[PDB]
Amino acid sequence: DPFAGDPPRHPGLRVNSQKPFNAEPPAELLAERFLTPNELFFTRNHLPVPAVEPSSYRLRVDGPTLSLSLAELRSRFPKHEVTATLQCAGNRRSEMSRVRPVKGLPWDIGAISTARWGGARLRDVLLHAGFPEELQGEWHVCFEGLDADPGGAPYGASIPYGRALSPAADVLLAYEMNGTELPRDHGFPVRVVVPGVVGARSVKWLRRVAVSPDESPSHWQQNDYKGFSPCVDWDTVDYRTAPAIQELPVQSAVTQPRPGAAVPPGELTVKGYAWSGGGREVVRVDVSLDGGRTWKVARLMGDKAPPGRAWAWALWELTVPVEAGTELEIVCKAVDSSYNVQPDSVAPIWNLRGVLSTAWHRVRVSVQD
Amino acid sequence: RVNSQKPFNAEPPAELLAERFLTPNELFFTRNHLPVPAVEPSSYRLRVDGPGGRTLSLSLAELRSRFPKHEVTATLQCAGNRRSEMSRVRPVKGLPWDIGAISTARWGGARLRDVLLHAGFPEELQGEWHVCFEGLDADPGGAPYGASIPYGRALSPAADVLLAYEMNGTELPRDHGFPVRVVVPGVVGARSVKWLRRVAVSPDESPSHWQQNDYKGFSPCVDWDTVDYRTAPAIQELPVQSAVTQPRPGAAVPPGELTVKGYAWSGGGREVVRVDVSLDGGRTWKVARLMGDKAPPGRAWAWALWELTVPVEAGTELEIVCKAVDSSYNVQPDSVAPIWNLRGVLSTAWHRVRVSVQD
Ligand SMILES: Nc1nc2c(c(=O)[nH]1)N[C@H]1C(S)=C(S)[C@@H](COP(=O)(O)O)O[C@H]1N2
Ligand SMILES: Nc1nc2c(c(=O)[nH]1)N[C@H]1C(S)=C(S)[C@@H](COP(=O)(O)O)O[C@H]1N2
Ligand SMILES: [Mo]
Ligand SMILES: [Mo]
C-alpha cells in the first residue's frame, strides 16, 4: 500500500476516492464560513501524499540554480498573504454524468474551497534567481511536485511567465494556509497557489520551479484538463486541439436548501457561492424558484476586492416567501465583471472528462403544508 | 442597414459583414448619439490634463509626428449588437440592431500610454483611477459624449489603447471620429470615444450620462420602474459572442453541400478557441474551422471568422446554431430570456438561423 503513509482526514468529508485520497466537504458545511476551515477544504490528490521532513526539504529553482530550504523561503522573502478560492476543473462533474457517462472523480458542488494563503511571492523568488521581470515571446514557469507515478514522473503544471512575474497576479509559494502551516494533504511544506486559475496548476509539495520557452510537458498539462466540443468522444479526442485550462469561467451553486428537501411554508432563505476566474468579480447572482422562468437578485456577502483581483468567491443569500404545498425548482446563475454568464443547460457543454461544468445549478424542493 | 438617420446609425448587410477579415471603411458599422462634428484639422487641439501631469494641447500634426505610430487590428462591438433577439422576448429600449453592430479595422495612432507618460503621469497609480474622454459632439444644452476606462488599462502596454488617426490605412473617416478617436481594444464600443477633444486623468469614473446611466447589465426581473444604474458596473470588457452570417434566415438552400459561415469574438483580449455549429437546433454539434492568424496571448482583439461545410439533404429543415468558447473557457448561453434586460444590451445567447433545403 503506497498510501499507507497518507495523513488522517476529517470524517465529515464526502470521500470520492480513498487511494489516492479525494474528498469534498458536504454541501451543508461548504459555504458556512467565507474561509473554508483547513479540515474541510476539498482535497484532490492524484498520487500518494509525500512525507516530507521539513529540515532537509529543498526547493530547486533552475535559474538562467537555487536550492532553498524552508527556513530560507520563510526568511529571505517578504511574506505576502492572498485570499483565493481553488476550484477543481471537475467541480460539478456529477451534472455531466447525468447527460452521458464521463471519465473522472464524481464531484458534486464542493470541489471548491477558499483560504487565506501566506508565503513568498513567486515573482520575488524568480527575481532572486536572476530572471528578468519580463521576457519577450511566450515563456512559461514549470512546477514539479514531490509526488510521483510508478514510472517516477512527478505531478507537474505550468503557468505563463507573465502571470508568474506580475505583482498583481498574487502567485504565491505558500507555506501557510488559514494562518497555520500547510497541512500535508494541501502540500506541506510548500505549494504553488495560482489565484484565478484552475486548481490543477496549484502544484503541491513543490520540488522544482523552472523557466521554459514551452508549457510543462507533464501529462496533466498536455493530456488532461482541457475543454472539447460535446461531439468529441474517446476515439476522436486530440489534446493538441485545445488550450490547457488556466482561467476558469463564471460559476455558482446552491448550498441551501438541498435537493429533495421539504421546506416549511412562509419564508425560505436560499444560499450558495459564486466565483469567476482571472480575478473577475461576481457582479450579480440571479436566483429563480420556478426553474429559471423568473428571477430575483441575491444579496452578495463579503468585502469588495480590487479590480482584476477578485480571487475569492462571493457567498450569496436570498430570503423569499414560499407557499405551502408547492414545488420549487431553485436555480442560481452568476454574472462576472466582463458580463460573462452561465449557460442554461449541460448537454451543450458536455465533454468526455466532465470538466468545466458551469450550467445552471438546479435544486428541487417541495414546500410543506 | 440604417437603424436611425438623425442621429445616424447603421450596420452592414449580414451578407457582406464577415466576407473580409478587415471591414471596409464604407461598411464599418456607425453609431452616433449626436450630430457629427465638422472638425477643421489645423485648428484642432487635443487637450490632455490631470493631477500630476503636464497639460498638453496637441495638434493633429503633433499627435502624428511626436508619438511613434502603433497599429492595432481590433474589433469594435456595440453593446446593442443583436438587440433584435432581445426584442423577440420582450420589447426593449434601443437601436434595433441585428448581427452587424460589430466591425473590424486596422487602427493606427499614438498609444494612449505614450501620450499620458509624456504628460508626466506615472505608469501606475494606487487606488482606482480613471482616464476620461470627451468628444466634440454635443447635445443642444452642450454636454459632450464621454466615457472612461480604468487608469490601469490606459497605461498598460499590452492593452493597446490607441488615440487613432488612421483606419484601415487611410485618414479616420468623419463618421468614425475624424481627426482622432480613442480605440479601446477588447472593450464595448461605447468607450471608444470619437472626435476626441479631451483626455483627463481622474479619481472617479466619467460623470457622463453614457458612463453613469447607460450601458450596464441588469437582471431580467428589472423593469423601468425599478432600474437603478448604481447597482451595476459600467460595461467594459464584453462576453464571448458569435453569429451566423451565411446562410440567412428563411433561405432555401440547394441540396448537396452547404457552407455555413460567421464570426466569433470575445472581450478582454481572450481568443476564441472553438466554435461549435449545429444543424438540428442545438441537439448535436460539429466543430467549425477558424480562419486567420493567431494573436499573442491576451491580445486577441480581432474577431475570428469561421466556416464549416456540411452535407445537406433535399427537402429537409435545418436550424443552424453557433456558439463560441474563449481562452478562459467562457461560453454562450442557450437562450435569451434569462439574459433579457430592459435595454436589450449584452445579447450573446446562441444565434439560431432556420433554413430549408430544396426541393
Ligand atoms: N503535486 C500535486 N499538486 C496538485 C495535485 C496533485 O495531485 N499533485 N492536484 C491538483 C489538483 S487537480 C487540484 S484541483 C488542486 C487541489 O488542491 P487541494 O487538494 O489543496 O484542494 O491541487 C493540484 N495540485
Ligand atoms: N463622441 C462619441 N463617440 C462615440 C459615440 C458617440 O456617439 N459619440 N458612440 C459610441 C458607440 S456607443 C459605439 S458602439 C462606437 C461606434 O464606433 P463606430 O461608429 O466607429 O463604429 O463609438 C462610440 N464613440
Ligand atoms: Mo483539479
Ligand atoms: Mo455602442
Swiss-Prot record, chain A:
GO BP terms: sulfur compound metabolic process
Entry's localization field: Mitochondrion intermembrane space
A GO term from the CC aspect: mitochondrion
GO MF annotation list: heme binding; molybdenum ion binding; molybdopterin cofactor binding; sulfite oxidase activity
Full protein: residues contained: 95 to 459 of 459
Involved pathway(s): Energy metabolism; sulfur metabolism
EC number of this enzyme: 1.8.3.1
Chain sites annotated for binding Mo-molybdopterin: F42, T43, R44, N45, H46, C88, D147, H186, R191, S202, V203, K204
Residue numbers spanned by region Disordered: 1-21
Keywords, sorted A to Z: Heme, Iron, Metal-binding, Mitochondrion, Molybdenum, Oxidoreductase
Role description: Catalyzes the oxidation of sulfite to sulfate, the terminal reaction in the oxidative degradation of sulfur-containing amino acids.
Textual note on the cofactor: Binds 1 heme b (iron(II)-protoporphyrin IX) group non-covalently per subunit.
Gene giving rise to this polypeptide: SUOX
Reaction(s) this enzyme catalyzes, per UniProt: sulfite + O2 + H2O = sulfate + H2O2
Keyword Oxidoreductase annotated: yes
Region entry Moco domain, spans: 2-226
Subunit structure: Homodimer.
Cofactor: heme b; Mo-molybdopterin
Protein's name in the database: Sulfite oxidase
Region of interest called Homodimerization, as start-end residue ranges on this chain: 227-362
